[PDB]
Design a protein around this ligand. Structure first.
Ligand SMILES: *[C@@H]1O[C@H](CO)[C@@H](O[C@@H]2O[C@H](CO)[C@@H](O[C@@H]3O[C@H](CO[C@H]4O[C@H](CO)[C@@H](O)[C@H](O)[C@@H]4O[C@@H]4O[C@H](CO)[C@@H](O)[C@H](O)[C@H]4NC(C)=O)[C@@H](O)[C@H](O)[C@@H]3O)[C@H](O)[C@H]2NC(C)=O)[C@H](O[C@@H]2O[C@@H](C)[C@@H](O)[C@@H](O)[C@@H]2O)[C@H]1NC(C)=O
Ligand code: LAM
Ligand SMILES: *[C@@H]1O[C@H](CO)[C@@H](O[C@@H]2O[C@H](CO)[C@@H](O[C@@H]3O[C@H](CO)[C@@H](O)[C@H](O)[C@@H]3O)[C@H](O)[C@H]2NC(C)=O)[C@H](O)[C@H]1NC(C)=O
Ligand SMILES: *[C@@H]1O[C@H](CO)[C@@H](O[C@@H]2O[C@H](CO)[C@@H](O)[C@H](O)[C@H]2NC(C)=O)[C@H](O)[C@H]1NC(C)=O
Length: 602
């Protein structure tokens, strides 16, 4: 007879209920399973009724693969899923944290900390829109963004993924969600999931909760703070996410007062689900449940029980699905985990899938392939890059002539530094590779390239990665642009207790600036010991991790636009002051939050 759940003209809730009521335990648990593409097969996906696949950092079908290659890969996995008895389409997830960053040729936008410096939520919203198009351009329908952590200690390797240390700024930036998913209807209830259609993607608010408040900025560690602070600082943005209809929420590896988030039923079910009324699905982090126990995985059975009972709906296994599905099946077959729990998880997962139209459009649209790296997106990124720059110094003394804007016409100029012509360094972590990379890893424009594309044709441009003092003094230069900073990093490989950029960097700035007036471009995902760099430079700009569009940097250096960016974090005098945020009693910053010199277009 008639099959309600397959009827597109029927309400989401009715369809969910109809489909759920037909599912077997194996099919229900399968929906709760998310596996890495590396361990997926048509048989595996079909036989285990897999509900979702993801692509971890760097997990690509081929280096430099095209948009169609991605679409083909996703579709291949989908055909397998659509062939099951119920034909429930899978949702493919990926880390498009600043563009479809794993994908080659994809537009790379400035990382969040830089976006916070723009104080322009609408811009961030437009980036979310561009990002959705580029993610769908590769056939993917789910982005693990935005990260709305409120980084409170720069020593955190993931601080660049935090818009600001001030939650009011992080809140304003949740506009990325409607950009990615689309604007929610005027009626809309806070907490319901939403996705406009096949041209949008389901978003993810992560990492619930307090991931940006770990002691000493140690990643995945403990966040020691009263419930007032937890709710005053780390919780606010999630409510905005609820109001804007975020589709999913990922749990944090971090603990809150000794308790693992992946096991905290009070917050996940009690607060997020019951209090906040979140109706989308809650997903774990990469082996997040394994880490509930220490050693990690030392009691996977306990890990599955604790996390599921806590309230999580989908688990990012993401490799040993056999064990996950086996163990969870036993716990259910044994009464250790009630069917209501399983039925709730599946309800939430199916609600999200029906709502976003996955049952109507399970396959990729070949016509979206051109969206990947569309010039307009690059122009947008370029704009974001420029607007995220923060001018810290612009003249050695109160009476010096302002160095920036620099003249586009000069006899001979010098571009130098380890970050002057290194697209990978410029993009930072979460780009092509998980930990990011060095060199020309994708399609873009380096600072050196941008400079050459901006100057007058009569202007001779010379490049030196690390020239010595003499080379500069006898070079007959009019001025120099030196770029230096941190190297790409992600998560733990990024935690740093000394926060001083690697060498050569300072030496290059001192050697260059000693020979000719200079403008130092500091590439970093956070504030770093900067007094020595300021000492040597005539002008210095904090460019954060601008992304693939280097011209955004020169658009400001050469006066096409005036600097407008303002520090989205506190800039410390020394690491021993940390933690140290705006509003603290001992607040003695080198540059207070909100600081930013300005200039006007020529
Ligand atoms: C302040 O704390 C930080 C973090 O604790 C510390 O940096 C870390 O230092 C570790 C060792 O001291 C280092 O581990 C070794 O890494 C080697 C490879 O490292 C290169 O490649 C990775 C990416 O694969 C980059 O992240 C690294 O920055 C490094 O990159 C190369 O760096 C050189 C020097 O500038 C440059 O000429 C190359 O072009 C560049 N190439 C690349 C790939 O970009 C391994 O082979 C080895 O087995 C260890 O695992 C960490 O990687 C590093 N963390 C990061 C992200 O930088 C920092 O230490 C200072 O800086 C490092 C780079 C090194 O020069 C130290 O001697 C120096 O002291 C520390 N600073 C202070 C104040 O002590
Ligand atoms: O150890 C592991 O190695 C993998 C290598 O692909 C990484 O993706 C994960 S980052 C893990 O990945 C998720 C999905 O990719 C992100 O959304 C999340 O923010 C991050 O913590 C790391 O915890
Ligand atoms: C927060 O971070 C701290 C510091 O990284 C964590 O402490 C560390 O905990 C691990 C185990 O969880 C300790 O590992 C050692 O392992 C060997 C065997 O592998 C064992 O013989 C040692 O006795 C020890 O367990 C490590 O020593 C310890 N580091 C120190 C000195 O503090 C802490 O567990 C993290 N907590 C949270 C909330 O994540
Ligand atoms: C020169 O630059 C200043 C600094 O940005 C401009 O003033 C800002 O203008 C923005 C809007 O463009 C306002 O939101 C800010 O409040 C202003 N900042 C302050 C305190 O001045 C100024 O309009 C620019 N003038 C020209 C001719 O471009």
């Amino acid at each position: 007879d008639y099959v309600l759940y397959k009827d597109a003209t029927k309400p989401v809730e009715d369809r969910v209920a109809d489909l759920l009521g037909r599912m077997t335990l194996a099919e229900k648990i399968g929906q709760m399973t998310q596996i890495e593409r590396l361990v997926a097969t048509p048989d595996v996906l079909r036989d285990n009724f897999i509900g979702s696949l993801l692509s971890g950092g760097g997990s690509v079908p081929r280096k430099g693969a095209t948009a169609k290659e991605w679409q083909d890969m996703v579709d291949g996995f989908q055909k397998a899923c659509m062939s099951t008895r119920l034909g429930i389409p899978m949702i493919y997830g990926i880390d498009a944290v600043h563009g479809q960053n794993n994908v080659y040729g994809a537009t790379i936008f400035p990382h969040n900390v830089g976006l916070g410096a723009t104080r322009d939520p609408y811009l961030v919203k437009r980036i979310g829109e561009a990002t959705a198009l580029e993610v769908r351009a590769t056939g993917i329908q789910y982005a693990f963004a935005p990260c709305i952590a409120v980084c409170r200690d720069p020593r955190w390797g993931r601080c660049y993924e935090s818009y600001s240390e001030d939650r009011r700024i992080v809140q304003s930036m949740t506009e990325l969600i409607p950009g990615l998913q689309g604007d929610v209807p005027k009626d809309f209830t806070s907490g319901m999931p939403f996705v406009a259609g096949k041209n949008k993607v389901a978003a993810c608010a992560k990492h619930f909760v307090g991931d940006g408040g770990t002691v000493d900025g140690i990643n995945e560690n403990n966040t020691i703070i009263n419930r007032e602070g937890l709710m005053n600082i780390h919780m606010p943005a999630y409510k905005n996410a609820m109001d804007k209809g975020v589709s999913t929420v990922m749990i944090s590896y971090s603990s809150w007062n000794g308790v693992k988030m992946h096991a905290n039923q009070d917050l996940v079910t009690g607060y997020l689900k019951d209090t906040l009324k979140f109706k989308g699905f809650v997903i774990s982090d990469w082996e997040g449940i394994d880490r509930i126990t220490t050693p990690a995985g030392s009691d996977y059975s306990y890990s599955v029980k604790a996390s599921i009972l806590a309230g999580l709906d989908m688990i990012m296994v993401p490799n040993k699905y056999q064990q996950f599905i086996s163990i969870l099946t036993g716990h259910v077959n044994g009464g250790v985990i009630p069917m209501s729990r399983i039925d709730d998880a599946v309800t939430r997962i199916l609600r999200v899938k029906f709502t976003m139209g996955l049952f109507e459009n399970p396959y990729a649209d070949p016509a979206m392939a051109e969206q990947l790296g569309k010039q307009e997106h690059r122009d947008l990124a370029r704009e974001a890059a420029r607007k995220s720059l923060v001018l810290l110094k612009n003249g050695k003394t109160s009476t010096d002539a302002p160095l920036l804007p620099l003249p586009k016409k000069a006899p001979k100029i010098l571009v130098a530094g380890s970050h002057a012509d290194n697209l990978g360094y410029q993009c930072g972590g979460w780009t092509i590779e998980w930990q990011g990379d060095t060199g020309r890893t994708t399609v873009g424009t380096t600072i050196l390239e941008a400079v050459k594309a901006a100057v007058d044709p009569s202007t001779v441009v010379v490049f030196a990665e690390n020239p010595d003092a003499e080379f500069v003094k006898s070079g007959g230069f009019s001025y120099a642009i030196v770029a230096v900073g941190e190297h790409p990093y992600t998560e733990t490989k990024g935690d740093n207790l000394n926060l001083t950029i690697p060498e050569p960097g300072l030496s290059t700035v001192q050697a260059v600036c000693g020979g000719v007036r200079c403008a130092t471009v500091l590439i970093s995902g956070r504030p770093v010991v900067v007094q020595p760099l300021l000492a040597a430079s005539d002008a210095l700009v904090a460019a954060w991790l601008p992304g693939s569009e280097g011209q955004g940097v020169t658009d400001a250096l050469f006066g096409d636009f005036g600097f407008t960016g303002r520090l989205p974090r506190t800039w410390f005098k020394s690491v021993d002051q940390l933690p140290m945020n705006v509003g603290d009693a001992h607040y003695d910053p080198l540059f207070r939050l909100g600081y930013g010199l300005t200039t006007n277009a020529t």
